[PDB]
Amino acid sequence: LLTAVVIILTIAGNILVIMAVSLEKKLQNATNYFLMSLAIADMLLGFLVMPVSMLTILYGYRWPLPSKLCAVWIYLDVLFSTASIMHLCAISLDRYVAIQNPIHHSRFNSRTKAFLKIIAVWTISVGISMPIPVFGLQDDSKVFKEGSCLLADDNFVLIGSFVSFFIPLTIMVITYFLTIKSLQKEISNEQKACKVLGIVFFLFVVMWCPFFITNIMAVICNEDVIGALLNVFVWIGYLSSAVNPLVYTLFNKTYRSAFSRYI
Numbered sequence: 001l002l003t004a005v006v007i008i009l010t011i012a013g014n015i016l017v018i019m020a021v022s023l024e025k026k027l028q029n030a031t032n033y034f035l036m037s038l039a040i041a042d043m044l045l046g047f048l049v050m051p052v053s054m055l056t057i058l059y060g061y062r063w064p065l066p067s068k069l070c071a072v073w074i075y076l077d078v079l080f081s082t083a084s085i086m087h088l089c090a091i092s093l094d095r096y097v098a099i100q101n102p103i104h105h106s107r108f109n110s111r112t113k114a115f116l117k118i119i120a121v122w123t124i125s126v127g128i129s130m131p132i133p134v135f136g137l138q139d140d141s142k143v144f145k146e147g148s149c150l151l152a153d154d155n156f157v158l159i160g161s162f163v164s165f166f167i168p169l170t171i172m173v174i175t176y177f178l179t180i181k182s183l184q185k186e187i188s189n190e191q192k193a194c195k196v197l198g199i200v201f202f203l204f205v206v207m208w209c210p211f212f213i214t215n216i217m218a219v220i221c222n223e224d225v226i227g228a229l230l231n232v233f234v235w236i237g238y239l240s241s242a243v244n245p246l247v248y249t250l251f252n253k254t255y256r257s258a259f260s261r262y263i
């Protein structure tokens with residue numbers, strides 16, 4: 001099956017990134033520590049969540065797993081997906097701040113800033129993903145629907161899709177536009193950086209955008225077609241966790257050398 005390839009690529013990429021950060025003396029700085037935290041989140045998703053979804057695919061969408069375990073499963077899904085999304089948003093904000101005024105960025109570029117950023121993004125993701133365990137375990141009807149298990153809370157879906165992908169999307173759009181308008185004011189290094197930023201932004205938009213917009217159209221509005229579209233797009237969005245470890249690292253020569261050495 002095609003879904004078994006994605007889990008293999010996710011875990012392979014995150015192992016390679018983790019060993020590249022940990023076993024290299026030159027890559028150990030704040031940015032690669034934030035990237036390591038992102039890789040940790042993507043590994044936790046691709047280890048605890050995606051094989052369960054593959055078992056759901058194989059089992060005909062009746063839930064073999066315990067019912068109570070589905071609510072915590074949705075909790076882990078939302079937790080790790082939000083963690084990845086605001087990790088990318090914080091990466092984009094840090095890139096814009098470091099590119100617009102590089103002198104003032106180096107005055108406060110210690111490891112304390114990176115630790116505070118990691119703490120902030122994980123606390124934000126935990127707070128966003130907080131109600132699913134508390135309300136889903138008390139009432140089983142809020143997470144189950146005719147054997148299949150999905151978020152049946154419409155208002156929670158709207159709020160947690162507006163605060164997790166419609167604030168970060170506009171933040172990333174604004175920072176990408178401003179970073180493009182900042183580097184163009186000045187040179188193959190800057191053009192290569194612009195190409196990399198554009199590739200990253202458009203890959204993120206292409207990978208993640210259809211899932212949230214069809215999730216919104218599922219609730220705000222033919223049910224089988226929308227359900228199948230959400231079914232395909234939630235697996236398309238899982239492919240982004242196997243792409244961010246590669247794209248954010250392979251543009252460096254040291255990362256390419258380390259990945260060729262370790263394999």
Ligand SMILES: COc1cc(CCN)cc(OC)c1OC
Nearest residue numbers: 077078081082151157160161164
């Ligand atoms: C918070 O954003 C979400 C992120 C995912 C990631 C799914 N792989 C699923 C959701 O609903 C279950 C979300 O809330 C609507």
